[PDB]
Swiss-Prot record:
Belongs to the TBP family. This is TATA-box-binding protein. It is found in: Nucleus. It comes from the Eukaryota. One of its GO terms (molecular function) is RNA polymerase II-specific DNA-binding transcription factor binding. The lineage of its organism: Eukaryota, Fungi, Dikarya, Ascomycota, Saccharomycotina. The keyword DNA-binding applies. General transcription factor that functions at the core of the DNA-binding general transcription factor complex TFIID. Binding of TFIID to a promoter (with or without TATA element) is the initial step in preinitiation complex (PIC) formation. TFIID plays a key role in the regulation of gene expression by RNA polymerase II through different activities such as transcription activator interaction, core promoter recognition and selectivity, TFIIA and TFIIB interaction, chromatin modification (histone acetylation by TAF1), facilitation of DNA opening and initiation of transcription.
Length: 180
DNA sequence: GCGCAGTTGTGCTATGATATTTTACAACACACTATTATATACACAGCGTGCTACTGTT
């Protein structure tokens, strides 16, 4: 082994606590998009940490694109400050990470059909529909996308340890189904 | 109201044997999904660039 998964995307939610006028928000923000007809939220962005926020009239906000939990909270506080600077009585509350995505490379090809047959109740593999095997782990409850190349995607985690836990649990199985 | 003469209507049509063949429309309420990110990869469609051929001019 020796491989440890790399975090790729962190999704979080934040309650600003006050109602927002989206045209005002979009108008005053330096990096905003807002087309009511397409989606009901201002799509705001900041350069550091590089992230994207979906800002709603209710004052709720979704922050995505961060590569670390630190970066997620940091960028979230920053978006909240922007809203304040524009003039609303916003508050940075209820910061919570909802989804963590990770990925790695085991460095060997995998026999997906064998794995799907062996771990049938957790696996779903339809190569004509999507080339990767969808593995639904029980403990921890994580979803893994397994590819012939040996590249692995882990998602559905609320905490970093779950990403790490799942990979540790899957590695022996990937080894059992290697090609070379 | 009674009798008579049409029409309808109702049973059955030999004994045993052997061999195959399949009600509508409108309104209201409740449930479900676009949007944004991330690794992943196979696929398909379009766009751009390069090469070859044909036509025109010297």
């Amino acid at each position: 082994s020796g491989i440890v998964p790399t975090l790729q995307n962190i999704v979080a939610t934040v309650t600003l606590g006050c109602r927002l006028d989206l045209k005002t928000v979009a108008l005053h923000a330096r990096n905003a998009e807002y087309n009511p007809k397409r989606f009901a939220a201002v799509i705001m962005r900041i350069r550091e940490p590089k992230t994207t926020a979906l800002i709603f009239a209710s004052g709720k906000m979704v922050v995505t694109g961060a590569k670390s939990e630190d970066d997620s909270k940091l960028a979230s506080r920053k978006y909240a400050r922007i809203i304040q600077k524009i003039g609303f009585a916003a508050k940075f509350t209820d910061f919570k990470i909802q989804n963590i995505v990770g990925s790695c490379d085991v460095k060997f090809p995998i026999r997906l059909e064998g794995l799907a047959f062996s771990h049938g109740t957790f696996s779903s593999y339809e190569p004509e529909l999507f080339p990767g095997l969808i593995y639904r782990m029980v403990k921890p409850k994580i979803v893994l996308l397994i590819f012939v190349s040996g590249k692995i995607v882990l998602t559905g985690a609320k905490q970093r340890e779950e990403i790490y836990q799942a990979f540790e649990a899957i590695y022996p199985v990937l080894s059992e189904f290697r090609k070379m």
